[PDB]
Design a protein around this ligand. Structure first.
Ligand code: F6C
Ligand code: CLA
Ligand code: CLA
Ligand code: CLA
Ligand code: CLA
Ligand code: CLA
Ligand code: CLA
Ligand code: CLA
Ligand SMILES: CC1=C(/C=C/C(C)=C/C=C/C(C)=C/C=C/C=C(C)/C=C/C=C(C)/C=C/C2=C(C)CCCC2(C)C)C(C)(C)CCC1
Ligand SMILES: CC1=C(C/C=C(\C)CCC[C@H](C)CCC[C@H](C)CCCC(C)C)C(=O)c2ccccc2C1=O
Ligand SMILES: CC1=C(C/C=C(\C)CCC[C@H](C)CCC[C@H](C)CCCC(C)C)C(=O)c2ccccc2C1=O
Ligand code: SF4
Ligand SMILES: [Ca+2]
Ligand SMILES: [Cl-]
Lengths: 42, 80, 143, 170, 222, 749
């Protein structure tokens, strides 16, 4: 029946790439950008 | 740095100066009380904020107040 | 530039770290009449030499804790200690005693540096110094 | 009386008893120093890129294994080696992004702490930001290469096994 | 409504009154009290005024909102426990469960918390997983966060500052550890850890009850 | 007079009773506020603060010890009297498998006699779980008159102990040179207290207990048994039981000891009849350890040249006289430690509390697996209660050890005395000790608890092949499994040919079942046992971290360099340096009390669930064992959810469904413990200034009614609020577990 993740909805390939980007690809760049922002010197 | 303020209810008992672990306080001549002395806080860049000076004060209310302010590496008591 | 033998001590993990050499170090010098054991403010027991001793510590509070130990835990008292602040360029600054007496006594010439002629319960109440920058004790009036 | 008057195995660090360390056999013996001081982080004379390259090779190599044996793909050989390879790749890229942003944040004017010009830390010898960027590039290159070398040895384990048993001499 | 309603309404009255006591006391003593006459010169949030005068822990007005958040959470717990059990007994048809079981406290403990937990905590068991698995996981997650709160709430700052000093010793003396803190590690401040522990207590308290209320109702009445 | 060491003053006065605070100079000032009332009981026994002479303090301590012994004898007298008047001891003596031990009856007051449950035999009482009946059966008691005699003897001993404490302080108190005779004290305690004590008990066992137990196991009714003195009196009766008593005490002096091998056996298992250890094997144990302890008591030089001097042995343990890898302790070694331990009472108390708590824990772990009394292992409530009680006593004692190691530091430690020795060198690298303890606590916390969280997530995902189970990623404790295999191979007909059975059946061997129920059987160690032992290691290590940190930084730290000047029990040093809250050593004892709770609670939970699912049960006629919870420890105790569902939610069926039954007091105390736990959090989360400012409004309302009181009402101090919160948390949280354990074990056996 459900051997893997599926989408019975329109553009069901979008979770497949959106969950990696939002959750483990773009976050460490965002953390690096915020760390460089809070540690930059006057 | 913290702000240590001394008010005119001071009686020059020196107990705040003796209780300071970091030597912020000293006694200066006043002629505003009969001891002839009043506390002063010039080296307030050294103040850690322990408020031992306030615990040592006998006047009600206190003649010395410490206002914890901007934290530096000296007021945080950091040996690292 | 500072005179004195380092006290006889085996070393500890409680001593100087990076911040000693990149921010500031303190030194305390004192003269003892005999070679005798004191407690390091960093933990442990060291031996002060007969004569002039010089010890580098990380904080001014450690130098003042040692000095309070010297003048209270020893008979005769050691009251001639001097505390200096050492900067990373090597610059040494004599800080304690700031005058040359001892803050607990009263010297003619020190000068007021925290005095506020008030009575605490009459600071300006905060509604009036809102968008000013001053806060309630760094002011000049009395309400 | 006895405080540094007898000569013991544990000495003050660098002969200075007011330093916050002790000279014990683990940080001061000839075997411990000969091992540590010749590790790529501390080997004398090396450029930061070569230090980082050797650190990365050694690191990306072993980082493949934990997910090959323990990962979610462990029931099958090919997927297990791929999951270990991409885990090593991700850990390498995250660690090197951290090295780069450490160098970016630390070396701003005269740095604070051990990378200040007045610092006496013997255990942190990369004093310049150029050293840190060369190290980051080397660790990235070496670690990604060592990870794919471990991956290639695990993918061809059937061949490497038949070789090391002499099964190729028929 | 019957006898079991009168008692829980008096408990709700107690809860609103004590929460109002804490908040009114801290608002009216915000500008100063007898223990600290010039409290308005120190701000809204400040740790204490030291250990003098017997000790002045939690003396600021911010600490009253701190101390009344626990009582608000407890009062709303009583309110929502009452509502949920009243309605579970009504929806099941067995209204006598709440009627002759909410007048004593073991009935609240056993016929509400213990009884309507059997489906939630069996969301995953050693035999399989149903759709209540996330509610069981969030139930345990809220218990974890609530327990972590007590670390910030019971242990205070100097313990952790001395622990962090030993950690700073360990880091500067380890080989191959080339990182160094740009900003010096210090323990969380007194007011900061009060806020952190309160946020943890709140988040775990909301997560535990949200997981229990969705799973004790969504399982009995799918 | 006999040793010329007494002549004590302090005349027995009565007037000195209506002046509380007479011991402290500030306590005898004049109350003024309410803090004085609480200060009266905060340092009432602290004789170190009161005076300054070590000899007066030692005299006070000696007489306080005597008064404590008197209190313990009063308690023993009460227990024997309860077993002799309000018990079913005779009924249990008749049938100790179908009768429930009971030694407490409740008066018929309001709803109250429902707690009197039917204990078998028509006896309406409360089922005791103290193991008194099983102990009295093993000692040799058969009727209640002997228990009454023992109660009277203990009461007489209590009166004698309160006379010895008054005579050794108010009449003829010892000198300080007598207290400092540690050589003589060790010699006498090792040879006369332990050695002669166990020798006398071996004599009792050989002549009273072994006879009575042998007849009891044979089948003789308890009042058909001869009284113990006939066993002592005529040797024909005693030689019927043992054929080695026909040769009297002759084979012992002529060194023919295998003649005695029928009452000094070396079997090493469990009696199949009773379930307890072999009584002959017990007697042989006591004979051997009497010979060992008496021989150990001749070690220390006292007045005759031969012996050791502990000062010489301490001063020689130093580099270069040590093992080469142990030579890091330097050329002073243990030089100043004999003067530390003979002048500080706190140093001695710290060592003795650590050893006493550790030994109480050892007692707990050795009496479930080698049940030493008849019909002990089958009464599961008693086994549970004894293990749990001795674990709690051990944990509390171990926390007090750290408490007094910190009191020694602030008060009794002298830097000039002990220079560059082991004590100085530990304080001189304590950052290394504490940071490595921090790292090992973190490593153990991830590799025990976060693996449980891994298991929860994998079980909720529906992927149990990814779990740390015995069916997923196996984590077998191969070293403990190997030790278990070595223990069961040793006892073969090998490395211990003398023993027949294994030292416990917990290691391996067979199954002992008594009265249908399992006395003991092998405790299999799988992945769940690996995980829970690492939970134990983690919790013990964080307790050690919390306690050792306060001991090592009791003098000073990098934050507060003069912490010894602030005291041992002080709240803080102000909101400066970031805020130095709970920097004292006392606050570390405070925070380690919580960690000892969290450590011992998981130990007693591990014991309860593992013994209840993999040992205890009901053997049928064939031999099949149906365990109580059904062997669900191996698959449910590997997730946190299975611990909350299959242990806490499932096994609390008997304590919450107890209303209206005879176990209803347990349900009441379960709820009471929850109340006291929650009430503690008022003191733990809140601070002192709130309560002092609320008391201001209450004092205003009182002043308006002119109901003002002289003693000025003040909030509890900071450390007192901490102590009150800790005491309440511990009390409620332990009463809860007590009610849960005891209601569960009194309902399903
Ligand atoms: C980088 C920098 C650095 C370095 C170098 O470089 C380091 C190092 C060390 C050494 C030496 C030692 C050992 C190791 C181990 O084993 O353990 C692990 C841990 C970890 C954390 C690990 C670490 C590693 C690194 C981090 C890597 C990196 C990663 C990546 C980069 C990330 C990514 C990024 C993105 C952007 C996101 C340690 C430790 C400790 N830590 Mg320590 N670090 C640090 C950082 C940090 C921070 C942030 C914090 C906060 C959280 C802390 C904390 C801590 C504590 C509590 C403790 C303890 O316990 C320990 C000790 O003391 O002993 C004794 N610490 N350290
Ligand atoms: C226990 C009290 C409680 C309960 C039963 C709910 C119930 C609900 N909330 Mg919530 N909420 C609460 C307290 C509560 N809230 C508090 C105190 C806050 C202030 C921070 C919020 C802020 C909030 C937001 C921003 C939203 C909701 C939403 C919802 C609805 C959808 C979530 C769901 O189906 O069930 C599950 C209920 C749980 C409590 C599950 C536990 C999850 C934990 C608590 C995460 C921790 C985060 C934080 C503490 C609160 C998050 C709550 C929310 C995200 C579920 C639902 C009716 C959503 C909505 O409006 O739908 C359209 C939504 O977007 N709430
Ligand atoms: C640890 C010591 C201890 C404890 C906790 C108890 C506790 C108790 N005793 Mg006991 N008792 C003790 C020592 C103790 N006793 C000693 C040393 C003696 C003299 C040998 C007695 C002689 C005694 C008698 C005669 C009675 C009790 C009774 C009781 C019960 C009620 C007492 C009361 O209501 O007031 C109670 C459970 C009463 C009881 O059990 O009621 C049936 C009662 O009749 N006790
Ligand atoms: C063989 C001789 C002997 C014996 C049997 C004892 C026994 C005892 N001593 Mg003692 N002691 C001795 C010689 C002896 N001592 C000598 C020579 C010195 C001088 C160095 C001391 C100095 C000393 C001190 C400073 C203290 C003791 C204490 C104790 C008691 C310890 C409490 C305990 O652990 O369990 C308790 C077990 C009890 C079994 C039953 C009571 C037994 C009575 C008292 C004597 C039995 C008589 C027996 C037939 C002989 C204990 C009853 C401690 C104490 O508690 O003070 C009262 C303590 O403070 N002793
Ligand atoms: C230390 C405590 C103690 C005490 C007070 C006694 C007392 C006694 N034993 Mg003895 N016994 C003891 C320990 C003790 N025993 C130990 C440790 C062993 C093992 C070797 C024995 C083995 C033993 C034998 C074989 C006999 C006694 C016997 C006796 C009784 C007199 C015979 C005799 O003294 O010779 C006497 C009441 C004799 C007896 O049975 O009299 C009733 C007897 O023949 N005992
Ligand atoms: C042989 C055992 C033993 C002995 C002789 C002592 C003796 C002493 N302890 Mg100590 N301690 C012990 C075990 C022991 N302790 C254990 C097992 C713990 C862990 C809980 C502690 C933790 C501890 C702390 C933190 C402190 C002491 C202190 C003291 C000193 C004063 C006690 C006092 O104020 O009056 C008696 C006090 C009471 C009777 C309070 C009773 C209230 C309790 C908490 C409620 C009990 C609940 C009940 C059982 C149910 C005194 C020398 C104090 C001190 O200042 O030392 C110089 C101190 O601060 N102890
Ligand atoms: C459940 C509640 C809880 C938790 C998780 C902790 C956790 C901890 N305590 Mg603590 N404590 C608690 C309750 C808790 N405590 C309470 C109620 C008190 C009241 C008295 C205390 C008092 C106390 C003291 C006095 C001390 C601690 C210490 C510690 C640390 C122990 C070291 C360790 O285990 O490393 C492992 C870390 C954990 C087990 C935390 C959970 C980690 C999870 C399982 C993994 C998370 C995965 C991943 C990282 C998540 C990333 C997601 C991303 C989005 C952020 C640790 C972080 C001791 C310490 O500092 O040790 C060095 C210390 O001395 N505690
Ligand atoms: C490594 C741990 C170890 C331990 C704890 C023991 C313990 C013991 N051995 Mg033993 N033994 C060992 C290794 C060990 N053995 C090895 C490696 C061998 C050679 C195979 C032996 C061969 C041996 C013999 C022949 C006997 C013992 C006996 C004993 C028991 C008497 C106590 C004593 O010797 O004095 C004791 C319980 C004696 C015994 O069994 O008690 C009657 C005895 O007869 N052992
Ligand atoms: C301390 C010590 C120890 C340990 C050691 C260790 C820890 C080990 C190891 C190890 C390791 C961990 C090793 C490693 C390695 C590696 C390597 C060997 C690498 C590599 C590589 C390569 C070759 C790559 C390549 C490439 C590139 C770069 C590019 C493209 C791709 C390719 C693939 C081609 C012991 C105790 C034993 C003893 C001695 C001392
Ligand atoms: C545990 C604990 C610490 C130590 C805790 C520290 C130093 C926190 C550091 C842990 C890591 C570095 C942060 C964890 C990150 C959080 C999971 C998310 C925070 C991210 C937001 C800030 C964006 C204290 O300093 C303290 C001070 C006063 C009273 C109680 C306590 C206390 O209980
Ligand atoms: C409630 C609370 C108080 C208030 C608690 C007080 C004042 C003690 C309560 C004891 C009451 C006042 C009993 C005293 C009453 C008299 C002894 C009369 C009793 C009547 C009998 C004689 C019958 C604190 O002072 C405090 C301090 C620091 C942290 C937390 C807290 C805290 O939580
Ligand atoms: S809050 Fe902390 S620092 Fe302030 S008085 Fe209380 S214990 Fe002391
Ligand atoms: Ca898989
Ligand atoms: Cl589960």
């Amino acid at each position: 029946d459900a051997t893997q993740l599926e989408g019975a909805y329109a553009a069901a390939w979008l979770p497949w790439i959106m969950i990696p980007m939002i959750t483990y690809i773009l976050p460490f760049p965002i953390f690096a950008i915020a760390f460089l922002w809070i540690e930059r010197e006057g | 740095s913290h702000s240590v303020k001394i008010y005119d209810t001071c009686i020059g008992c020196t107990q705040c100066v003796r209780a300071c672990p970091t030597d912020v306080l000293e006694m200066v001549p006043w002629d505003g009380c009969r001891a002839g002395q009043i506390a002063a806080s010039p080296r307030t860049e050294d103040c850690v904020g322990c408020k031992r000076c306030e615990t040592a004060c006998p006047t009600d209310f206190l003649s010395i107040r410490v206002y914890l302010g901007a934290e530096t590496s000296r007021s945080m008591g950091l040996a690292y | 530039a500072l005179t004195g033998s380092m006290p006889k001590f085996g070393g500890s993990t409680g001593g100087l770290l990076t911040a000693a050499f990149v921010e500031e170090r303190y030194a305390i010098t004192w003269t003892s009449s005999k070679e005798q054991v004191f407690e390091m403010p960093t933990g442990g027991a060291a031996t002060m030499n007969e004569g002039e001793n010089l010890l580098e510590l990380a904080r001014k509070e450690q130098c003042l804790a040692l000095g309070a130990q010297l003048r209270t835990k020893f008979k005769p008292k050691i009251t001639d200690y001097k505390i200096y602040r050492i900067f990373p360029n090597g610059e040494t600054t004599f800080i304690h005693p700031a005058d040359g007496v001892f803050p607990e006594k009263v010297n003619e010439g020190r000068g007021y540096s925290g005095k506020k002629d008030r009575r605490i319960g009459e600071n300006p109440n905060p509604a009036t110094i809102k968008f000013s920058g001053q806060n309630t004790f760094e002011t000049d009036m009395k309400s | 009386s006895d405080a540094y008057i007898s000569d013991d195995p544990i000495q003050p660090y660098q002969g200075n008893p007011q330093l916050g360390n002790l000279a014990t056999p683990i940080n001061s013996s000839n075997l411990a120093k000969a091992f540590i001081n010749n590790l790529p982080a501390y080997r004398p004379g090396l450029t930061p890129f070569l230090r980082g390259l050797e650190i990365g090779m050694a690191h990306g190599y072993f980082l493949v294994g934990p997910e090959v044996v323990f990962g979610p793909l462990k029931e099958g050989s090919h997927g297990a080696n791929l999951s270990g390879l991409i885990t090593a790749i991700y850990i390498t890229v995250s660690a090197c992004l951290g090295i780069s942003i450490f160098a970016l944040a630390t070396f701003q004017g005269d740095p604070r702490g051990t990378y200040n010009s007045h610092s006496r830390d013997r255990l942190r010898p990369l004093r310049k930001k150029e050293d840190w960027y060369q190290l980051s590039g080397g660790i990235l290159m070496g670690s990604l290469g060592g990870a794919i070398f471990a991956y290639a040895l695990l993918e061809n384990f059937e061949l490497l096994d038949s070789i090391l048993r002499g099964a190729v001499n028929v | 409504i019957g006898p079991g309603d009168f008692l829980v309404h008096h408990a709700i009255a107690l809860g609103l009154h004590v929460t109002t006591l804490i908040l009114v006391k801290g608002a009216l003593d915000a500008r100063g009290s007898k223990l600290m006459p010039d409290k308005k010169d120190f701000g809204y949030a400040f740790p204490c005024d030291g250990p003098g005068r017997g000790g002045t822990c939690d003396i600021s007005a911010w600490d009253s909102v701190y101390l009344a958040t626990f009582w608000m959470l407890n009062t709303l717990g009583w309110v929502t426990f009452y509502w949920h059990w009243k309605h579970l007994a009504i929806w099941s048809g067995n209204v006598a469960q709440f009627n002759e079981g909410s007048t004593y406290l073991m009935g609240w403990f056993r016929d509400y918390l213990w009884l309507n937990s059997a489906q939630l905590i069996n969301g995953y068991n050693p035999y399989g997983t149903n759709n209540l698995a996330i509610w069981a996981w969030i139930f345990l997650f809220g218990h974890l966060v609530w327990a972590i709160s007590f670390m910030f709430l019971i242990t205070w700052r100097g313990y952790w500052q001395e622990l962090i000093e030993t950690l700073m010793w360990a880091h500067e003396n380890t080989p191959l550890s080339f990182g160094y803190p740009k900003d010096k590690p210090v323990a969380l401040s007194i007011v900061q850890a009060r806020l952190v522990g309160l946020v943890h207590f709140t988040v775990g308290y909301i997560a535990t009850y949200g997981a229990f209320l969705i799973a004790s109702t969504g399982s009995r009445f799918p | 007079a006999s040793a010329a060491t007494e002549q004590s003053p302090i005349p027995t006065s009565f007037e000195r009773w209506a002046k509380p605070g007479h011991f402290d100079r500030t306590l005898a000032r004049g109350p003024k506020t309410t803090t004085w009332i609480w200060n009266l009981h905060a340092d009432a026994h602290d004789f170190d603060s009161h005076t300054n002479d070590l000899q007066d303090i030692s005299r006070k301590i000696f007489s306080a010890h005597f008064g404590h012994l008197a209190v313990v004898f009063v308690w023993l007298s009460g227990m024997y009297f309860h077993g002799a008047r309000f018990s079913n001891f005779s009924s249990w003596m008749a049938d100790p498998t179908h009768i429930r031990p009971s030694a407490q009856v409740v008066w018929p007051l309001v709803g109250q006699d429902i707690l009197n449950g039917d204990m078998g035999g028509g006896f309406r009482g409360i089922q005791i779980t103290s193991g008194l009946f099983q102990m009295w059966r093993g000692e040799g008691f058969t009727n209640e008159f002997q228990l009454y005699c023992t109660a009277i003897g203990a009461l007489v001993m209590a009166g004698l102990m309160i006379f010895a404490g008054w005579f050794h302080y108010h009449v003829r108190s010892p000198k300080l040179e007598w207290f400092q005779n540690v050589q003589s004290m060790l010699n006498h305690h090792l040879a006369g207290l332990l050695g002669l004590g166990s020798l006398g008990w071996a004599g009792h066992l050989i002549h009273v207990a072994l006879p009575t137990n042998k007849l009891l196991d044979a089948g003789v009714a308890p009042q058909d048994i001869p009284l113990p003195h006939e066993f002592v009196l005529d040797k024909a009766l005693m030689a019927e039981l043992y054929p080695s008593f026909a040769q009297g005490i002759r084979p012992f002096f002529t060194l023919n000891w295998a003649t005695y091998s029928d009452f000094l056996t070396f079997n090493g298992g469990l009696n199949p009849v009773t379930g307890g250890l072999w009584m002959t094997d017990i007697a042989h144990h006591h004979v051997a350890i009497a010979v060992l302890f008496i021989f150990a008591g001749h070690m220390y030089r006292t007045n005759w040249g031969i012996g050791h001097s502990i000062r010489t042995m301490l001063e020689d343990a130093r580099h270069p006289k040590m093992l080469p890898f142990l030579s890091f302790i330097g050329p002073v070694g243990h030089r100043g430690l004999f003067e530390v331990l003979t002048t500080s009472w706190h140093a001695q108390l710290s060592i003795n509390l650590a050893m006493m708590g550790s030994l109480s824990i050892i007692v707990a772990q050795h009496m479930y697996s080698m049940p030493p009394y008849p019909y002990l292992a089958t009464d599961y409530g008693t086994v549970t209660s004894l293990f749990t009680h001795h674990m709690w006593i051990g944990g509390f004692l171990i926390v007090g050890a750290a408490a007094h190691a910190g009191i020694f530091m602030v008060r009794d430690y002298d830097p000039a005395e002990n220079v560059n020795n082991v004590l100085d060198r530990v304080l001189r690298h304590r950052d290394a000790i504490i940071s490595h303890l921090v790292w090992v606590c973190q490593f153990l916390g991830f590799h025990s608890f976060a693996m449980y969280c891994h298991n929860d997530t994998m079980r909720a995902f529906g992927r149990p092949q990814d779990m740390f189970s015995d069916t997923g990623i196996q984590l077998q404790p191969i070293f403990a499994q190997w030790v278990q295999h070595i223990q069961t191979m040793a006892v073969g007909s090998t490395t211990a040919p003398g023993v027949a059975s294994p030292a416990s059946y917990a290691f391996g061997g067979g199954l002992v079942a008594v009265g249908g129920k399992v006395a003991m059987m092998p405790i299999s160690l799988g992945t769940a046992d690996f995980l829970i032992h690492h939970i134990h290691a983690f919790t013990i290590h964080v307790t050690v971290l919390v306690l050792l940190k306060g001991v090592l930084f009791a003098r000073n730290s990098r934050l507060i360099p003069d912490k010894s000047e602030l005291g041992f029990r002080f709240p803080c040093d102000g909101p400066g340096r970031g805020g130095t809250c709970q920097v004292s050593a006392w606050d570390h004892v405070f925070l380690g009390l919580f960690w000892m709770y969290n450590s011992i609670a998981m130990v007693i939970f591990h014991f309860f669930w593992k013994m209840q699912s993999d040992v205890w049960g009901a053997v049928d006629a064939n031999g099949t064992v149906s365990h109580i919870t059904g062997g669900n420890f191996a698959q449910s105790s590997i997730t946190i959810n299975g611990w909350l569902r299959d242990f806490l939610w499932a096994q609390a069926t008997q304590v919450i469904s107890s209303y209206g039954s005879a176990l209803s007091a347990y349900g009441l105390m379960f709820l009471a413990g929850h109340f006291v736990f929650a009430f503690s959090l008022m003191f733990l989360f809140s601070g002192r200034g709130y309560w002092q400012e609320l008391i201001e409004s209450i004092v205003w309302a009182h002043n308006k009614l002119r109901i003002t009181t002289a003693i000025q009402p003040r909030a509890l101090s900071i450390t007192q609020g901490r102590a009150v919160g800790a005491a309440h948390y511990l009390l409620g949280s332990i009463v809860t577990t007590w009610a849960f354990f005891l209601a569960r074990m009194a309902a399903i056996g």
